[PDB]
Amino acid sequence: GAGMKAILQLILEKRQEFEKLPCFEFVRDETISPEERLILYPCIAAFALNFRDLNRYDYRDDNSSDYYQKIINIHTQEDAKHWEWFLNDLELLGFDKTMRFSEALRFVWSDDLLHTRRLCHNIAVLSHDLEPVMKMVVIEAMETAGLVIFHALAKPGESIAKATRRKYLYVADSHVEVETGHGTENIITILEQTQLSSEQEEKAKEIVNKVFQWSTNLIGEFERYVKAHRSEKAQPTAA
Amino acid sequence: GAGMKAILQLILEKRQEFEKLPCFEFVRDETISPEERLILYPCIAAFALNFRDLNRYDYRDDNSSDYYQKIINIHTQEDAKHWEWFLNDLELLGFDKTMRFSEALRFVWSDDLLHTRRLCHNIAVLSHDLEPVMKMVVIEAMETAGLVIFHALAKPGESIAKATRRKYLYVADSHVEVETGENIITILEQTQLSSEQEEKAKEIVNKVFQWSTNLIGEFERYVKAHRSEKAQPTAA
Ligand SMILES: N[C@@H](Cc1c[nH]c2ccc(Br)cc12)C(=O)O
Ligand SMILES: N[C@@H](Cc1c[nH]c2ccc(Br)cc12)C(=O)O
Ligand SMILES: [Fe+2]
Ligand SMILES: [Fe+2]
Ligand code: NI
Ligand code: NI
Ligand code: NI
Ligand code: NI
Ligand code: NI
Numbered sequence: 001g002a003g004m005k006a007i008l009q010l011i012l013e014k015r016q017e018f019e020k021l022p023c024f025e026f027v028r029d030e031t032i033s034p035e036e037r038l039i040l041y042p043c044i045a046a047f048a049l050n051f052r053d054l055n056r057y058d059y060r061d062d063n064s065s066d067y068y069q070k071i072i073n074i075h076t077q078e079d080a081k082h083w084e085w086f087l088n089d090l091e092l093l094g095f096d097k098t099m100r101f102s103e104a105l106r107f108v109w110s111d112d113l114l115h116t117r118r119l120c121h122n123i124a125v126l127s128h129d130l131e132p133v134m135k136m137v138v139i140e141a142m143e144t145a146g147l148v149i150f151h152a153l154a155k156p157g158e159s160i161a162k163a164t165r166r167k168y169l170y171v172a173d174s175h176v177e178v179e180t181g182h183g184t185e186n187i188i189t190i191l192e193q194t195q196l197s198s199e200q201e202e203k204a205k206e207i208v209n210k211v212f213q214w215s216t217n218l219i220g221e222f223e224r225y226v227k228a229h230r231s232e233k234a235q236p237t238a239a
Numbered sequence: 240g241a242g243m244k245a246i247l248q249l250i251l252e253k254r255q256e257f258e259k260l261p262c263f264e265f266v267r268d269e270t271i272s273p274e275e276r277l278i279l280y281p282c283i284a285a286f287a288l289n290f291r292d293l294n295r296y297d298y299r300d301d302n303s304s305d306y307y308q309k310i311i312n313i314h315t316q317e318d319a320k321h322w323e324w325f326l327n328d329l330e331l332l333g334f335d336k337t338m339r340f341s342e343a344l345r346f347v348w349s350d351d352l353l354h355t356r357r358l359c360h361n362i363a364v365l366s367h368d369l370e371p372v373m374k375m376v377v378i379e380a381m382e383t384a385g386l387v388i389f390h391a392l393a394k395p396g397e398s399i400a401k402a403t404r405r406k407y408l409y410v411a412d413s414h415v416e417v418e419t420g421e422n423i424i425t426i427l428e429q430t431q432l433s434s435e436q437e438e439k440a441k442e443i444v445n446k447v448f449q450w451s452t453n454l455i456g457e458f459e460r461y462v463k464a465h466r467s468e469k470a471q472p473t474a475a
Contacts, residue, residue, distance in 0.1 A: 053357075097340055099338070101328050104340055108347070109342075124360065
């Protein structure tokens with residue numbers, strides 16, 4: 001209907017703003033070494049395993065007979081595996097450093113990674129009382145923001161993968177391609193053939209605005225971390 | 240009122256049941272070295288900094304002008320400091336080990352610490368749409384569970400503190416005494432609950448103790464799976 005078309009169009013408008021943030025202009029800048037552009041990588045530690053748990057324990061409901069919830073369950077099974085790819089590339093990039101346990105805790109719970117650390121928390125709280133069709137809007141918005149980030153990160157990641165002859169799995173075109181999905185339908189196909197009540201329309205606008213605001217807060221922390229480390233880089237080793 | 244009095248009574252009944260859990264009988268058992276009884280200490284890594292955040296970001300509302308919310312805000316300023324004491328005692332016990340960054344992440348996000356890691360998350364979801372007096376019930380319940388655990392942990396804690404002449408701050412009587420030190424139960428004792436608030440307050444107390452019980456189950460399972468990894472304190 002006209003409601004759902006406004007919702008999907010809001011997601012495109014937010015994606016077009018999000019794509020233009022300075023972080024992504026930096027990450028895409030082929031005049032800076034890919035090792036310097038990926039100095040933000042360790043910041044994702046505060047997010048990636050929280051995102052696995054969001055999929056496993058918040059999005060998923062294994063007991064639902066609901067049409068929409070079953071499609072969510074299939075998609076979130078796959079999306080909850082990507083944290084291992086994060087750990088794989090953490091090691092390849094030279095960021096899996098020996099440190100005290102307390103240094104790792106103080107890093108993850110840094111005040112400079114608050115928005116990074118709480119993006120999944122915020123989504124879980126938003127998602128607590130949503131019917132399955134409305135959870136599909138959360139997931140579609142969140143996945144749209146993720147695909148912008150990983151399409152950008154895969155640029156320096158693929159440069160290092162080629163130069164070192166190593167297979168990257170997280171900052172990699174393979175992650176973007178598996179995430180987009182191409183069996184079971186994509187959520188965007190389901191949403192395109194669903195009509196929203198006026199109440200669902202106003203809730204879906206709140207959802208899209210929040211997911212993009214929280215994602216922009218995360219990207220702002222990445223930008224400030226990069227600025228505090230431009231004198232630092234990833235330390236990949238050539239195979 | 241009969242309502243509030245029923246809620247303060249249910250907190251004492253849940254406290255009495257919680258105190259009996261097998262983990263606490265183990266931690267109190269002075270025939271076991273206190274280094275073995277604190278094998279569970281690193282598990283608290285998946286909780287203590289989440290609890291700091293619960294107090295800073297979820298319980299606290301610096302935009303609020305309400306009377307009860309202002310009392311909560313003040314309470315949260317104290318409780319948001321105890322994570323540093325956790326990190327102090329981690330180092331003293333020999334648990335602040337050098338490891339790969341990925342080994343620290345895999346520890347905190349272990350499936351065997353799921354309930355530990357999600358306790359504050361669960362409290363934040365429970366609390367996010369509560370009026371302030373109902374947030375006070377969550378805080379009083381959660382503090383009641385915490386007082387049971389730190390009363391028990393302070394036994395092996397203060398044994399090691401005296402034996403090594405070091406100042407322990409988290410598994411210590413100073414922590415137990417500051418928890419106790421207007422206080423919230425005073426306000427609750429003088430506050431009248433609608434039937435709706437009484438039904439919700441029952442749910443809040445049941446959930447706080449069920450989630451705390453889940454956490455304590457994981458601590459007990461951890462000790463049984465890591466029976467060699469005793470604390471390694473050093474004499475001063
Ligand atoms: N594809 C991501 C998940 C993701 C989905 N949306 C995101 C937004 C921001 C950040 Br950082 C990450 C994401 C993953 O596998 O961790
Ligand atoms: N006094 C504790 C807080 C606390 C309050 N309730 C608790 C329940 C379980 C565990 Br483990 C800890 C708590 C602290 O300062 O971290
Ligand atoms: Fe992913
Ligand atoms: Fe405390
Ligand atoms: Ni998918
Ligand atoms: Ni630095
Ligand atoms: Ni809500
Ligand atoms: Ni307190
Ligand atoms: Ni282990």
